[PDB]
Amino acid sequence: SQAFQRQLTALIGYDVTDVSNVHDDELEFTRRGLVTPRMAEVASRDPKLYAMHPWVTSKPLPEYLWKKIANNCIFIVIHRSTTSQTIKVSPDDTPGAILQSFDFVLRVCGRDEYLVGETPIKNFQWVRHCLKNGEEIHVVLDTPPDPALDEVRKEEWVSLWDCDRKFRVKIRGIDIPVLDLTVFVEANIQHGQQVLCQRRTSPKPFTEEVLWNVWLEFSIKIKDLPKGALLNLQIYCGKVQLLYYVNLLLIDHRFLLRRGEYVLHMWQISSFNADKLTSATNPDKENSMSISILLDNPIALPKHQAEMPNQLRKQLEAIIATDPLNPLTAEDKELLWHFRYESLKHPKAYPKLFSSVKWGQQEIVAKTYQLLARREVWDQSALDVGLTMQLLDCNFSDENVRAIAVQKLESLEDDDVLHYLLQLVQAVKFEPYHDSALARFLLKRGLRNKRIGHFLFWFLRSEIAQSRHYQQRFAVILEAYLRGCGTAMLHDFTQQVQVIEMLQKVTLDIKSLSADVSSQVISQLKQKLENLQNSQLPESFRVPYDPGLKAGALAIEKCKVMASKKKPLWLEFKCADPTALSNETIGIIFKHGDDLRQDMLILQILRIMESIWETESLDLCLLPYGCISTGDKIGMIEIVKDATTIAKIQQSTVGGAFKDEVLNHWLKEKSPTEEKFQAAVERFVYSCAGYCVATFVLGIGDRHNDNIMITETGNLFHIDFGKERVPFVLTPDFLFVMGTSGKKTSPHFQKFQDICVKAYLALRHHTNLLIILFSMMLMTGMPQLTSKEDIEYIRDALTVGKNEEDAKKYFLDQIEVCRDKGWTVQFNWFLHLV
Ligand SMILES: Cc1nc(N)nc(-c2cc(C3CCOCC3)cnc2Nc2cnc(Cl)c(NS(C)(=O)=O)c2)n1
Secondary structure, three states, X not given: OOHHHHHHHHHHOOOOOOOOOOOOOHHHHHHHHOHHHHHHHHHHOOHHHHHHOOOEOOOOOOHHHHOOOOOOOEEEEEEOOOOEOOEEEOOOOOHHHHHOOOOOEEEEOOOOXXXXXXXXXXXEHHHHHHHHHOOOEEEEEEOOOOHHHHOOOOOOOOEHHHOOOEEEEEEEEEEOOOOOOEEEEXXXXXXXXXXXXXXXXXXXXXXXXEEEEEEEEEEEEXXXXXXXXXXXXXXXXXXXXXXXXXXXXXXXXXXXXXXXXXXXXXXXXXXXXXXXXOOOOXXXXXXXXXXXXXXXXOOEOOOOOOOOOHHXXXXXXXXXXXXXXOOOOHHHHHHHHHOHHHHOOOHHHHHHHHOOOOOOOHHHHHHHHHHHHOOOHHHHOOOOHXXXXXXXXXXXXXXXXXXXXXXXXXXOOHHHHHHHHHHXXXXXXXXOOOOOHHHHHHHHHHHHOHHXXXXXXXXXXHHHHHOOOOHHHHHHHHHHHHOOOOHHHHXXXXXXXXXXXXXXXXXXXXXXXXXXXXXXXXXXXXXXXXXXXXXXOOOOEEEOOEEEEEEEEEOHHHOEEOOOOOOOEEEEEEEOOOOOOOOOOEEEEEEEOOOOHHHHHHHHHHHHHHHHHHHOOOOOOOOOOOEEEEEOOEEEEEOOOOEEEHHHHHHHHOOOOOOOOHHHHHHHHHOOOHHHHHHHHHXXXXXXXXXXXXXXXXXXXXXXXXXXXXXXXXXXXXXXXXXXXXXXXXOHHHHHHHOOOOOOOOHHHHHHHHHHHHHHHHHHOOHHHHHHHHHHHHHHOOOOOOOHHHHOHHHHHOOOOOOHHHHHHHHHHHHHHHHHHOOHHHHHHHHHHO
């Protein structure tokens, strides 16, 4: 009867039904509320295309991928059983057209990946992958997968503007189980980041319980309170210092004003952090500080039923023209609002326009909704993700404003959703209420596409497993997905969850036995792994970072604990698919100890940078490997085949000291033919510039060379994204490959500069998008770096306000700063330990 709910809880990692940490029914209200959204998307989804989940794109084929096609022909090798043909086809041919040259369907050899539907083969991502990598398109004639397998289980389920009183709250007192300075309570009325009104209490001596019993009367009137308005209670001591915080929505999910007694358990500090805005309370009731308060005045918020001077218009357009991180003066705001209707014609003015609204004022908000009612330009405008994300950040608490951002997301094809999914999932932390347009948007795009749904699951589970601030919310959303994804997915998820759970235990036990690394622990590992092969590891499970790949039995011989501070497991799996015409294992690094969430964000931005470069016909051969945060301080990473670190190349031919020549003839040896050395050297030139530019922008380029890797075919790539300085790594050994020895300029070194610039200016063309991603990253992902100082790095990095020519100068100077420092920093890392 209810075994399903116990099944669901073990996949989510949290008990949705639990009510030990709440003071209203918003979570439960959101469960019931999310049912329609699910049911509708389940109802309407095409079952045949659902089971096969064809991953396709409407984007044009890039210039560099065309060049790898001769005479509008591509080869496709179909397999029968032991036999195989090799058809010729044109790019624009549909899989129907191709199949009718021989019901069946064309499945990719090795992977649960299908080539079906009315798109030209040039528009499948697998075909674009084969062409990019220079591999041939193998596929096995197969039966379509039964949609009966994807079945879903059968489911069962006084006006506010008429009160001229000033809002007030009573602070009864504060209490803390365990604790010579004094302390007070600060009360703020807030809308987004904006503080509409503020009041303090008189200081008292800080004992383990402190009672005040005061009313704090605020200047704001009850009618002027906007929907979303948080009451934010903070505790300072003292030269002041913040110790604890907590928030309470003054208008609930049913539009009623909040009333009565509350005992709220607070969050402790150790700055803009997403955690500071949460409606959640601390679930640790035994140790947390608690504040007690009283609200009393049932009141309900209603639901809404010339030419301009030459000079002033330019003043307006300069304001619209600035970056998202450029502040607005009171002068700027009054202008933007006065000329309201001129500003509405420009989609780009929107973030700044709605940051000019006085939200603590009933009539202004009313006027603002009349503005949103009259939006023809916005609804017509071409989708701009940069502008869309802006309206979903921490500055916008108004549901109606945020809703026009989601409206624009509706038009994104699936491929583009994948590109932004993680960030949109992190953007849910900025919503005031648990139920929201954004939550529903993610829910249904995941219910429509198995690939989206897969990564949606893992991104949610990641955040539920290591955030007490938002797990309650993310949990509710996950359940809502799992109840729609289909029995075949829930099966697949349950195997993935088990495998990682079995592997965690092994890691806990192993870690204890160490203090470098012995080989008795290597056998102890291989012992327990062999013991897991028959109890109770399933025959097959999907690779969470690459769900097409089913991985089966273990190659116990090749598995080993890594020579590293955290003792990660270096595992290797056989493939479960007989039809895979290869024999390379699946290599996974399983890591317990650290939080991989920051590693995801960075790698996901790397993929966004690629897609940007793609739109300007550029390819810089970045290598963003699979990396999934799977649980509390655990996760999996992809092993890149035929790869080694730049530092280990030094420990061979030198073994403190560094030599220039070494890298070049490491490549020379690993390349058989001369052409392949020359192929592999150019891949190094692209790689290096791409990774140089990309780290400079993100401000993570000054790295230690045991964290830079390279493939035998010359592809460079950074790893592990957890005095005097260098803007990025361009060490003399790299330069040696490029054919410059101190101070020269090779035909290769100049092309490196030629690309570096093209890359940089290309990124610059999407300044706003990158500025807003960076901002969100730091606020939702990295609780270390969150201030004006931190976030404003990228403004400088992308050289806002400068022109295309002067920026080029700026970057080429950064190339020379590196040149001028050689091995100095690299040595200094080594020196500083000693
Ligand atoms: C993505 C990838 N691919 C490959 N081939 N290798 C690695 C990798 C390898 C190695 C050693 C292997 C033995 O030689 C010394 C280095 C260490 N780390 C690697 N990648 C990695 C990336 N990101 C993180 Cl967060 C970590 N975690 S860590 C440094 O093991 O704690 C590892 N990572």
